[PDB]
Design a protein around this ligand. Sequence first.
Ligand SMILES: Cc1cc2nc3c(=O)[nH]c(=O)nc-3n(C[C@H](O)[C@H](O)[C@H](O)COP(=O)(O)O)c2cc1C
Length: 353
Amino acid sequence: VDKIPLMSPCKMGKFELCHRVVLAPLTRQRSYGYIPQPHAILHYSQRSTNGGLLIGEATVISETGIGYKDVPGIWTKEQVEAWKPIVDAVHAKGGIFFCQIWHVGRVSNKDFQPNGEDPISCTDRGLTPQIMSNGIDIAHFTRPRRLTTDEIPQIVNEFRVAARNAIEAGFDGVEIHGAHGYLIDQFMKDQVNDRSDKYGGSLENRCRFALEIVEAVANEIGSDRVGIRISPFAHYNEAGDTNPTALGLYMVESLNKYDLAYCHVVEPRTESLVPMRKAYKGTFIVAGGYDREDGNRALIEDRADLVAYGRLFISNPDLPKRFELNAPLNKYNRDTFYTSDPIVGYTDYPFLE
Ligand SMILES: Cc1cc2nc3c(=O)[nH]c(=O)nc-3n(C[C@H](O)[C@H](O)[C@H](O)COP(=O)(O)O)c2cc1C
C-alpha cells in the first residue's frame, strides 16, 4: 500500500493525529430525551482510529438551544454522565474527540422552548416553513425574540459552561458551532443581524458575539482544546451575507490571536477557502463534498491540514482504512440519516470484508 496524503501524520495543537481523515459533526437525532444513548457508544466506537479526529454531533448547550427532537444536550449532570461511556469507547481506540457545542437560536419552535417561550436570536425575524427530512412533514418556526444588549453575555456564558461540561464528560476538546445559520452565525450574517447596538452594524460588531464566545471558551478550557466551525458561504436557514469572503477573512484573521486548536471551514455550494487558509495561521479543516481524490488533492495543494467527511463516514465505519487501501465505499442511505432507530442506518453499515 502506497502512502497517500490523507494518511499522513499531523500535529494539531497538543494532539498527535495519525492521519487527516476527520469525522465531521453529524446530527443523527437518536438521542432520546436529549440524553446521549448506548447506541452512540457503538456508533462512535465503530468510527474511532488511533490518532484519528472525531467531531461529535452538534450538542445543545441549554434548554433554549433546542430546535430538533432527540438531539443530545450537555447542560445537565444526567447528560454529562451519559457522554462518558461514549467518550471512553472512542478513547479506548485512541481517537481524539471534540464535542461540538451548539445553540439553534431562531431555528426552533416554542414547542421546543421552556414554558412555551419564543426562541432567542440577534433579530426578531422568524423563518419561513421548511420541509423536513422525510418530505412529508413541514417544519414551522416561531418568530424569535431579539436578545437585549446585556442578555447576550448570559448566552456567551452558556457556551462557556457547556465547554466546561464537555471536559467533565472526558472530551478532548470542543468545536464551537459558528455555522449553518444557528445562533452564532445568525449574529455574523448581515441578512439576519439587524442590530443597532455593538453586536450589529459593522462586520466587527456582527462577529463580536462569536469572538466573545471563543474567548469565553478558550479561557475556560484552554485555547489548545478549542476549535470553531464557520460557513461564511452557506445560506442554510435563510442566513446569507452580502460579503462572504470578507466575513470569512475577517473571522480567520480575528481568530489568529486566540491560538486555537483549529478552524473548521465549510466549502461553498468565485468563492474560495484559499484566501481564508492563507490568512489563518493554525490548523485548517475543510468539509463539504469531498471524496478520496479531492481529499488528497486539497492536502497536497496546501488547501487544508485536515479534511472532514460527513455522508461517507455515515455509511463507512472504516472510512480511513478504506481510503488507505483505496477500497470500495458503501453507498449511504439519506433516508435513515435522521430517522430514529438505534441500529438501522446508524450502526448497521458494514466494515470491509
Ligand atoms: C445527517 C447529517 C447531519 C449533520 N449534522 C451536523 C451537525 O450537527 N453539525 C454541523 O456542523 N454539521 C452537520 N452536518 C454537516 C456536515 O458536518 C458536513 O459539513 C457535510 O456532511 C458536508 O460533507 P460531506 O459531503 O462529506 O457529507 C450534517 C450533515 C448530515 C448529512
